[PDB]
Design an enzyme around this catalytic site. Structure first.
Site, short mmCIF file in Angstrom:
data_model
loop_
_atom_site.label_atom_id
_atom_site.label_comp_id
_atom_site.label_asym_id
_atom_site.label_seq_id
_atom_site.Cartn_x
_atom_site.Cartn_y
_atom_site.Cartn_z
N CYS A 141 -11.30 9.12 8.54
CA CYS A 141 -11.13 9.67 7.21
C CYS A 141 -9.99 10.69 7.18
O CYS A 141 -10.22 11.91 7.16
CB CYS A 141 -12.43 10.29 6.71
SG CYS A 141 -12.43 10.71 4.96
N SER A 145 -12.65 15.24 9.04
CA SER A 145 -12.93 13.91 8.54
C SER A 145 -14.38 13.79 8.06
O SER A 145 -14.64 13.30 6.96
CB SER A 145 -12.67 12.87 9.63
OG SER A 145 -13.52 13.09 10.74
N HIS A 183 -0.33 -0.58 8.26
CA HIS A 183 0.96 -0.71 8.93
C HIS A 183 0.77 -1.74 10.04
O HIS A 183 -0.30 -1.80 10.65
CB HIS A 183 1.41 0.63 9.50
CG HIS A 183 2.62 0.54 10.37
ND1 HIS A 183 3.85 0.12 9.90
CD2 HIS A 183 2.80 0.84 11.68
CE1 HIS A 183 4.73 0.15 10.89
NE2 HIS A 183 4.12 0.59 11.98
N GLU A 191 13.45 4.03 9.44
CA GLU A 191 13.09 5.36 9.89
C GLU A 191 14.01 5.86 10.99
O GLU A 191 14.39 7.03 10.97
CB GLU A 191 11.60 5.45 10.27
CG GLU A 191 11.21 4.68 11.49
CD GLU A 191 9.71 4.67 11.70
OE1 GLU A 191 8.98 5.13 10.79
OE2 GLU A 191 9.26 4.19 12.77
N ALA A 203 -5.57 11.15 5.86
CA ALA A 203 -4.77 11.18 4.63
C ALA A 203 -4.89 9.88 3.82
O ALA A 203 -5.31 9.90 2.67
CB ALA A 203 -3.30 11.51 4.95
N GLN A 204 -4.53 8.75 4.43
CA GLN A 204 -4.71 7.48 3.75
C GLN A 204 -6.18 7.12 3.51
O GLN A 204 -6.54 6.70 2.42
CB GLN A 204 -4.00 6.35 4.49
CG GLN A 204 -2.48 6.41 4.40
CD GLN A 204 -1.95 6.18 3.00
OE1 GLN A 204 -0.98 6.83 2.57
NE2 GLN A 204 -2.55 5.23 2.28
MG LIG Z 1 9.09 3.31 6.21
MG LIG Z 2 6.04 4.64 8.13
#
Ligand SMILES: [Mg+2]
Ligand SMILES: [Mg+2]
Ligand SMILES: NC(=O)C1=CN([C@@H]2O[C@H](COP(=O)(O)OP(=O)(O)OC[C@H]3O[C@@H](n4cnc5c(N)ncnc54)[C@H](OP(=O)(O)O)[C@@H]3O)[C@@H](O)[C@H]2O)C=CC1
Ligand SMILES: [Mg+2]
Ligand SMILES: [Mg+2]
Ligand SMILES: [Mg+2]
Ligand SMILES: [Mg+2]
Ligand SMILES: [Mg+2]
Ligand SMILES: [Mg+2]
Lengths: 489, 489, 489, 489
Positions: free
Chosen positions: D45, D78, D132, D221, D47-48
């Site tokens: 638990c 969390s 991701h 990035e 940020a996202q």
């Molecule tokens: Mg990116």
């Molecule tokens: Mg990223």
């Protein structure tokens, strides 16, 4: 001598694979000038060599032919053709050392032997030209750093190249410059001038690359152009006979069918070819094509994949070094097939009859050409490239079969195309056996009765055909070329 | 009261004639909410009135019906239908004075008497709605300045606007705001909410204008929609009979042919309708259509011009004032016609047979539709409007003839459409006499045999058919509408 | 002699008003050939007459000059120019009767007198040519039925026409064929050949019509080209003086400002002209322009409307018949204005200074050019036409003012443009008085300090400028022309 | 476990790399309903996790949090956050076994340990979600065949995904389905519902792929987003100081400059950022940017190539296994840097001053952004993906530096981004040394005076800026997104 494509990383491969740009008529304002007052030497005097030479001389260029010593002493056709047309003719030793542009117009399989004999004789900063990229790309021939390497590739046989030129026109042409060999940055100027001197800029010129030309050419010939026509010819002939059609009639149907249906293809793409069928026959042809595409997709993908990886050319060149054992074996088997030996029907077969009795043939053309196109585009090749190495060339190959069957096709095309064909054909025939077993009446050898069809389905099929990406670029490119032809009156 | 269009200069006329904008879904985010809590009163409970009312109440609007006192006293169908469905019903004096929106859904020919009776009862800043713009544009009806005047015009009959709504869908709809009557600038807000309350935003809504709606409607109906179907019906039946077709069979061919061929037109435009023919029949329909267009162009242009100038509606309204003398005379003459009195064959005519034996009919649809469309677009009307007042509406008019012949068409359509029809039809019939005399076998009443056709010619005809502006906009609009349907259901 | 445009109905007017099509380079393959070996006779030998003639002779055409008897006897400049350039020169009687093409290159105001003297001498089936359509369109000159009437209209003064031709290039050109006078259907062939012979096809040719050329030309000159520059010059000069700027400095600012700012306009449309300002100044210029457009819209509309209705030309020709009384009066008043008589500052004014001190001038250019364009497009005129008769011509007119003020502008332009100018100017000056009274510091005569602006607003203004329809066609047409120029090297 | 991308051939790689399709609103008609009644369990638990969870519960989904036993026992943040907000919380053993969807929202570096712990607890046919794709693509994590594997990747930090949702809006979002793990073909249904539950369909959702998301993210990035900002920060501060700028003032210039200039980038792309400069400054930024691109192209290409080949992530993961030795060494060296230790000026720097004194900074943004975009597109990545992983994200990264310098950036971003940064930055700094040595006054730390510039040059620069592919796609995407915002609010 490592495969050149394989020395490149993904980004580098894509950069070349995706190179294709129909060029502006304006881009050829200088014509052949860049080559004026320079020494152009063509190696070999064969189909492309003589005809490109005739055109280039008419365009003001200084053309001479370099032959092997024994070609001159034996008065080979090459030497006779060159001399009777009033060209200067000489040995490599007498002509190469002064040449500004050496144009390699020998058979592709022979390129290593030619290039390796000719390079050492070429002066510093001279240019080497090809009309097909296999030597640079698949073989990985290493060209001396100071030499500029370019390609000019007409999309028609030499005779058409000469003929269209005579009547103030020309032939669609692809050009490229090999980036490893453009030390003076004059590659494009040389290639454009060479292309213009053959008349290409009158009909349309595409700026491409050695890699794109080679990878797409191999895919087209292996799958749709030769592989599919051979597999299709054997499958259909055998099926007709198996279902009771008179063998001689079956052989003529197949021999002249591809040619007849691809003539509609030549005039208006898959759209027009399908349009020549009655409505119910069109709906059935469409459905057969969809089933074919689904069955054959893994095979077409395998071929593109092996072409990309270098596995195709590596395997073939292993056969070359083993005296073409596999080629000859497959060629022999091909010459013993029922279709190749069948007697030919004597009576007439009407034009529409080839369409109506060849529903499956039409579906095979559609499926194969779309699959070849899609698989190429999926591999980084641009639409225009995929089009010119598939649909565009289909009618000419259909013509050869019409002339003298699979035998004629396989002797007319290069050993690379022939080998490619067999590799595909011998996989595709077994593959389609279950499919052939379940054909329905009307699919092949008998007309599907014209009549009513559901409005919606007809609309949807028509839309699905003409909206295929190959039909869109096709309609566009044929539009350009027609426009160009009209201008040349 | 003078014709409103005629009080405008060219620039002002053009601004109106060319108003047509397919609206985004998001323009209807507010739905019908601008009318919530307001009093909506519909005058006359007929086909549009009852059905729009049903939708608007379901959309949460406050709907009541204002009838004439005698309609209530005599228990007319209007009063029956309204009370059956549970709506409040009252006299003008009871309901109009507090109405925020008075929707005039009475026949167009009656609008002057209706508007002049209802206006004095309307409170300050009330709004007056129409579903057709004839009263404002051609009659030049003058509306009290504080009244906002808007139009919401479904492009389908009432029963269909009801059932599509029930299905969570709707019907393509035109909206407009009369610029001489928008004192609060709230016209568009009122029009959009009314349209949304009927469900039009679920299908597609076009922002148009009173002027464009009227001029295009008049042109579509008198040329392609009614005039051409009437002229074509008579010409074709007479020619079938003249050339030996059994009369009863000929009458069925014509009675149901239009409906059958326009079913294809409905599903896929002229493109699909032509596609249903055999290739040789298609080439011939195309040629007949071009000849027809050349012959009819002056007549179509005359009708548009008279519609534009006001000559048409002034001429027609002089007949209104003369007890419809010309209308009734033309109507009677139409009833003594051979087609209208012919026996009807009870036997079978297969679907494909209406296409194959109706080559000329198909050519007449193509020619009339294209000509009307072109003539409108040449007159400042936008493609979309031109499309919706011709091709879009044709299948419905064909359906009326299928039901009960020209008699049914002329009683189903308005007196304006009927008069427009006759005015056109009685000129078009003699105009086409030489043309009919030179028809060839296959043109009408007998199939043209399927078979081979030249590749290029077939390609070019197919391209000329589908590239026509009416086909391009039609394919686009039917696209939007098909997409919206999929969402709704 | 009724106004020709007014004899046409709405559909007919729109058909001509909307005629504008940038032509394909390919369309001029025959060059000037259609006129080769024919007798071309130019009437008058003035600016266009001599320079078009020089070009046409160089292009292989047979050119001779027909002059009035007394022009020859008096050795007028025309006769001297013709003879010194080695042209054949003669009387109407000696040259007209054999002429295949008689080209009327006299001042427009004189066309009735010329045409009426020349027609009776022209053989059957000969062609009459104009470079401006006013005589045919506004005057309604009736041309003998057997005569073909065409227009070729360069968009540059004669000297530029000749100069660009010499360097292998040319000048954008408009062509038309008058539909009342194309009996042999050779109008387009004659016009294309005439255009090609002057070099127009090298720079771009637009297929248009007499009506479109005339209506758009009159609107452009009356509003933005001359009307706005005059009104703007007087308003701005007076405002500067009124707020304390040194009169001589004010007069130079205005005299050379239009030219300087319109040079950015010439290079890159309104987009580039605005881009030369600092960000805060650009935002202010944009806002001033929006206020201007709102104030002036009714006036611009009135002008377009009177131009369309024939009220403009009818009123002006009444002045012609009354010895140009109104013209002369307004011209005299113009010559007495403070700006016209002001002394001129002697010191330097830097290029950027004209931009920075001329915020209001820039806004007047933007507002006037957009309003003229919008109002034309609203009246049935095509974008390309509207562009060429407004923004395109602005820099040249700005140049004349730079040379010798309003005096120079009003003597350089035709009486029709001058009269048009005064009609507008004398309405526009009073109209903008309240507006001028409320200007803010920085609006005129003083730079607005560069600096920070809100990101969003800047983005929105930039987008609003470059997305204006005149900026889109402008960018496109300047792109074509630049491409053409490059080709001609 | 081997790198997954590397197990694919070129065709297969391309199919993935080029997946990116902005999705229609109507594709989300079902909203989150496919997940209704199902058990969704989020691991970790953070940020996202918290913020996606809040949205999904508000969207009617059943959301619980699975924490490690020690996290519960120790009352970690969390556990606090989850129970504070009223969510069920349990151990893996309690919640995972019945989970229909297990969403892995732990740091990427930890995914292997998390996935290998959670998999064995997951019931048959469960689904595993990521935000991701590094674990699947680069690590090559192998997921039990019956498990469906999907990705939903918001393009904004968690707090923003929460607050936009509360506003009835949402955040642009990428979705993907891993083709090796879609046994029921329900992946897209799961992914779309999860995305809709977070509110992504209110803004815009792109159908992409694990491969495209990873390769593009890594490239954005390490070059433009972090590498270029770090290299640029150090290079610019050092050069300001070297040339006499007061250190504290220089550090504020750099600390807040990026944020200020990229605010313009956020609102209107490179176009708006350049527009904020004076004309002469703009011409100079453009030139500096072109020089920069030429110098950096090999370095950018190297980074893309290493990312594509797996060399980057294998190299980085060897450092992971070596206790982050290189990371920590680079991090420490970064902390002893002059910029990172400089005093901070507390005085005022006006908004326009960051632009005017930051010409080189603006050029670095332009060059880096364009170069990264181009290099990605040259590698089979689609424009939209390339846009979202570079330009889109830059303003947020600039904001971190504004807060607490490079220290803040490197602790806010992942270890992968940080390592990527250093690897780039430590090569780019020495690379650019000769370039910095040749800067001219105005390039950095002092305004270039506004003034006149050549018209053509200004036009051409403006065209070259706005016609860049990243500007064209950026203007389009920001358009969609702005339109969606207006609907939602
Ligand atoms: Mg990116
Ligand atoms: Mg990223
Ligand atoms: N100027 C421009 O920028 C453009 C002009 N045009 C059009 O080209 C045409 C010609 O214009 P332009 O070249 O300026 O004309 P000019 O003023 O240069 O014409 C001079 C010639 O016209 C003759 N002329 C004048 N009046 C009469 C008459 N009553 N009867 C016979 N001849 C007469 C004169 O004869 P004499 O020698 O005896 O004195 C003289 O030879 C016009 O229609 C103009 O609209 C088109 C495009 C651009
Ligand atoms: Mg090939
Ligand atoms: Mg080949
Ligand atoms: Mg209608
Ligand atoms: Mg109607
Ligand atoms: Mg003009
Ligand atoms: Mg003029």
């Amino acid at each position: 001598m490592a495969n050149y494509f394989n020395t490149l990383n993904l980004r580098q491969q894509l950069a070349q694979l995706g190179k294709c740009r129909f060029m502006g008529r304006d881009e050829f304002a200088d014509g052949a000038s860049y080559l004026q007052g320079k020494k152009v030497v063509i190696v070999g005097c064969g189909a492309q060599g003589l005809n490109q030479g005739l055109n280039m001389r008419d365009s003001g260029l200084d053309i001479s032919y370099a032959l092997r010593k024994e070609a001159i002493a034996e008065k080979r056709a090459s030497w006779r053709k060159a001399t009777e047309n009033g060209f200067k003719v000489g040995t490599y030793e007498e002509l190469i050392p002064q040449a500004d542009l050496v144009i390699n117009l020998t058979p592709d399989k022979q390129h290593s032997d030619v290039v390796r004999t000719v390079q050492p004789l070429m002066k510093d900063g001279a240019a080497l030209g090809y009309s097909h990229g296999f030597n640079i790309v698949e073989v990985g021939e290493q060209i001396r750093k100071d030499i500029t390497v370019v390609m000019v590739a007409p999309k028609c046989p030499g005779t058409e190249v000469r003929e269209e030129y005579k009547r103030g026109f020309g032939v669609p042409t692809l050009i490229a410059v090999h980036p490893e060999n453009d030390p003076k940055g004059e590659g494009m100027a040389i290639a454009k001038a060479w292309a213009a001197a053959t008349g290409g800029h009158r009909a349309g010129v595409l700026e491409s690359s050695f890699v794109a030309e080679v990878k797409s050419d191999l895919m087209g010939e292996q799958t749709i152009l030769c592989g599919m026509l051979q597999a299709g010819s054997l499958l259909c002939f055998d099926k007709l006979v198996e279902e009771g059609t008179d063998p001689a009639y079956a052989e003529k149907l197949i021999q002249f069918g591809w040619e007849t249906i691809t003539e509609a293809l030549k005039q208006g793409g898959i759209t027009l070819m399908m349009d020549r069928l009655s409505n119910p026959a069109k709906l059935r042809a469409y459905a057969l094509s969809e089933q074919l595409k689904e069955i054959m997709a893994p095979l077409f993908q395998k071929h593109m994949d092996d072409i990309i990886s270098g596995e195709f050319s590596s395997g073939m060149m292993a056969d070359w070094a083993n005296d073409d054992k596999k080629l000859l074996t497959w060629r022999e088997e091909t010459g013993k097939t029922a279709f190749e030996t069948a007697p030919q029907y004597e009576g007439k077969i009407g034009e529409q009859e080839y369409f109506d009795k060849g529903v499956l043939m039409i579906a095979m053309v559609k499926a194969g050409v779309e699959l070849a196109f899609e698989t190429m585009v999926d591999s980084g090749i641009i639409e225009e490239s995929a089009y010119y190495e598939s649909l565009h060339e289909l009618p000419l190959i259909a013509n050869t079969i019409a002339r003298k069957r699979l035998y004629e096709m396989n002797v007319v095309i290069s050993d690379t195309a022939e080998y490619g064909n067999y590799l595909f054909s011998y996989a595709c025939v077994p593959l389609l056996k279950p499919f052939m077993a379940e054909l329905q009446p009307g699919d092949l050898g008998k007309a599907i009765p014209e009549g009513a069809v559901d409005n919606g389905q007809l609309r949807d099929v028509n839309e699905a055909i003409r909206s295929h990406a190959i039909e869109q670029v096709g309609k566009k490119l044929r539009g350009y070329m027609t426009d160009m032809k009209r201008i040349a009156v």
